[PDB]
RNA sequence: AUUUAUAUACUUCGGCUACGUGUUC
RNA sequence: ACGAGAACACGUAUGCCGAAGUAUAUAAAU
């Protein structure tokens, strides 16, 4: 869908990465993302678990303290809108979704990093 | 051919899976020094049985920014979970900002893995043959991995930077326990490097250990406390690797110098780059006053 | 003429990375979609190592060419020669009961071990995630016995169960020096599919 | 079209190949566009599917990401001009032009393979 | 709590429609 | 009452044979 592309070219500023995110802020985050996306390849139906959707919300959590830990955390949680997709997922409760949002962050994760310092 | 090998881990021995644990699934008891792993089925199945979820959300989704209230145990104490119910939602439990998990199997049960075992043994290889094709004589040398390790003898351990005077380092890695004794099969496919030929290796790189590195820490309290305790003048004599994390870099003076100040330029640019214009790995038990290093432990072959 | 069935299961006694279709995943069914052990590997380890355990000359080791009884179990016709295979290898499938154990005991069908790679004098990291099957999981494997001549039945039964043995005392797949591949045999059975040939003094460790 | 071959006989510099690029430095770029050969080759009509389109999205993802890791990558990536050929490709839906597509880059692969150290 | 993110080698090698048979009574 | 009229280019046999997705490099430093 490349907006995030568009977003991360809008935010190089005068240079810095989100106003101090660094790829390696996003370790937790990307490896709950692919934990997430091992549990969820591994399902047969589209019709999500139930305890993946605990785990979903659990990843929510995760969300909500990186964005309490770091101000830029908080930025790049808010602006790109992961927290309304998420919200959309749990509420539809579809596979295929969630491996479009999988590829969603990815992509984020390597534009950014080819987009660095 | 094929052999038996046991380990006895003289001391804490970390095997680092990658696994950051966060400020979450943890009791971090600061009256009786016991760290209680939460199960995430069972809490949660907890959390929805008795209509706490929601409330446990907004404690945990409302991040105080008090450090007094930034844990588990006070989220849990808020919503008045009685002590006989929380001990009950304990997974695990071993005697903390992040906590360094181990690497466990498919059941999580903690093992040896064939790589930071037969990885040691190959840098003990290496320094007594000085690379001797030691490359080539690889594919030849067969280790398999260890058998499970019961939770019993895991616990919690502080890193300590042990110098001249001490300083202690603010993060906490798991480790299996003292005196632990660990099997694994070995398999023999090159004749030339025998059994006793792999022992005397690593023996003797543990003596060069010694004469280089391991006798410039005296005149320390914790160090002429774990050296003497674990009897290295004997120890000479026996069997003895350090595995995986938490052992030093030398695991002449000048050229270890300049070697030194290479790979904390490599390492450290990023955070303390006070090396460019410039060290011991330890665990100090508060159980015993007792300071060990982290690493060391026997091999005896069969 | 007739047919001898090879029938029984495989246990996975530490790691197994078969890693055919390659972070660095597995060969895995795309029916259910389960991790299998393709028959070319079993076949593979089975000639190397047998082979290898009777004689081996680098003359020998030329050109894939090895002593008459491989050459006989496992089938060559190359050489301006008649002979075909007579073991037929299949594939291994995750058993069922197995399914019901992961299923109910809610262990994950698969690990991830993480590995690292520490340079010399440099002690630069340079990180890996590999995928590997459980330990415990079995597998159900199938061979077929064809009967050419009726009197070597006995001294190839006496072939393949030492074949089981030395891979029983070996790893299989890939990594196999890094600990993972080690598998173990048990409930063989032995039965005549097609023919009137008798399957009782046959037995298989 | 060949142009191909005339911009690899231009990337042999006094000898090293695009100043460090090797063939396995290609791997996971040739085994995606294979495994997206294999998945189109299968289709009947040339109107491209719309999962196939996000397919391509995540083709230009790994082009990115490996442009990201290695500077000879994104030398090679950059000077050939992958990039537009795959936005028009995009822009285009069409099969027969990324079969096209295909096998320019499978003669850029075959080329350099024979034209190496 | 702070940097990597799979890396270089090989991406199918060997060995290349025969017979009744064409046409007439 | 057409150099016409009858008339199956037809019948027997395969993509097989042998080949292991391998072989190296410890999730580390303060």
Redesign the interface.
């Known amino acids: ?2 907006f995030a592309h568009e977003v991360v070219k809008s935010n190089v500023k005068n240079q810095v990465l989100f106003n101090g995110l660094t790829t390696s802020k996003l370790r ?1 985050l990307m490896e709950q993302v692919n934990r997430l996306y ?1 549990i969820a390849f ?1 399902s ?1 139906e589209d019709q999500l678990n139930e ?1 993946f959707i ?1 785990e979903l ?2 990843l929510k ?1 995760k969300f ?2 990186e964005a ?2 770091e101000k830029s955390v908080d930025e790049f949680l808010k602006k790109t809108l992961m927290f309304p997709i998420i919200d959309r997922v749990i509420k539809k409760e579809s596979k295929k979704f969630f491996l ?1 949002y999988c ?1 969603y962050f ?2 984020l994760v ?2 950014a ?2 987009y ?1 310092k | 051919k094929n052999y038996e090998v046991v380990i006895k881990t003289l001391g804490p021995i970390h095997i680092g899976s990658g696994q ?1 644990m ?3 699934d943890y009791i971090y008891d600061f009256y009786n020094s016991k760290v209680y792993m939460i199960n ?2 069972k809490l ?1 199945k907890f959390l929805k049985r008795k209509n706490l979820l929601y409330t446990y ?1 907004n404690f ?2 409302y ?1 105080p ?1 008090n450090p007094r209230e930034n844990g588990l145990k006070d989220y849990l104490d808020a919503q008045n979970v009685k002590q006989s119910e929380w001990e009950a939602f304990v997974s695990y439990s071993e005697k903390l900002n992040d906590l360094h998990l181990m690497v466990r199997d498919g059941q999580n049960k903690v093992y040896l893995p064939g790589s930071s075992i037969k990885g040691a043994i190959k840098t003990t290889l290496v320094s007594k043959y000085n690379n001797e094709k030691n490359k080539d004589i690889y594919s030849k040398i067969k280790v398999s991995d260890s058998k499970p390790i019961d939770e019993s003898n895991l616990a919690i351990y502080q890193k300590i930077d042990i110098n001249k005077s001490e300083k202690s380092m603010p993060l906490y890695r798991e480790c299996i326990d003292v005196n632990t004794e660990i099997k694994f099969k070995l398999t023999i496919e090159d004749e030339i490097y025998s059994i006793n030929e792999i022992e005397q290796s690593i023996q003797d790189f543990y003596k060069n250990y010694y004469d280089k590195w391991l006798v410039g820490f005296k005149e320390t309290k914790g160090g002429r406390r774990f050296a003497l305790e674990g009897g290295i003048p004997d120890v000479l004599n026996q069997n003895i690797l350090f595995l995986g994390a938490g052992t030093g870099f030398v695991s002449n003076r000048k050229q270890a110098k300049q070697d030194s100040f290479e790979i904390l330029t490599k390492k450290f640019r990023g955070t303390y780059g006070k090396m460019k214009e410039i060290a011991l790995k330890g665990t100090t038990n508060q159980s015993r006053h007792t300071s060990y290093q982290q690493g060391m432990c026997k091999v005896s072959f069969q | 003429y007739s047919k001898i069935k090879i029938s029984g299961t495989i246990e996975v006694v530490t790691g197994l990375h078969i890693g055919g279709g390659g972070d660095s995943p597995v060969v895995r069914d795309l029916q259910t ?1 389960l991790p299998i052990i393709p028959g070319s590997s079993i076949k593979g380890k089975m000639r190397n190592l047998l082979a290898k355990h009777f004689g081996l000359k680098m003359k020998q080791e030329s050109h894939n060419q090895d002593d008459e009884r491989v050459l006989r179990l496992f089938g060559s016709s190359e050489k301006g020669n008649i002979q075909r295979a007579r073991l037929q290898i299949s594939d291994a499938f995750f058993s069922e009961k197995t399914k019901e154990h992961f299923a109910q005991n809610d262990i ?2 698969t690990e ?1 071990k993480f590995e690292n790679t520490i340079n010399r004098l440099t002690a630069v990291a340079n990180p890996r995630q590999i995928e590997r099957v459980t330990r415990g999981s079995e597998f159900d494997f199938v061979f077929i016995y064809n009967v050419d001549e009726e009197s070597q039945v006995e001294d190839d039964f006496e072939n393949i169960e030492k074949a089981i043995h030395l891979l029983e005392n070996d790893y299989l797949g890939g990594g196999g020096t890094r600990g993972n591949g080690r598998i173990q045999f048990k409930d063989t059975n032995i039965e005549t599919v097609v023919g009137e040939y008798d399957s009782t003094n046959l037995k298989i460790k």
């Open positions: 869908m490349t937790n091992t591994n047969n305890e605990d919300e659990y959590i909500y303290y309490g830990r479009d590829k990815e992509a390597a534009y990093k080819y660095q | 950051v966060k400020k979450q995430g089925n949660v959300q945990l989704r991040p920014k | 979609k994950a069908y991830t």
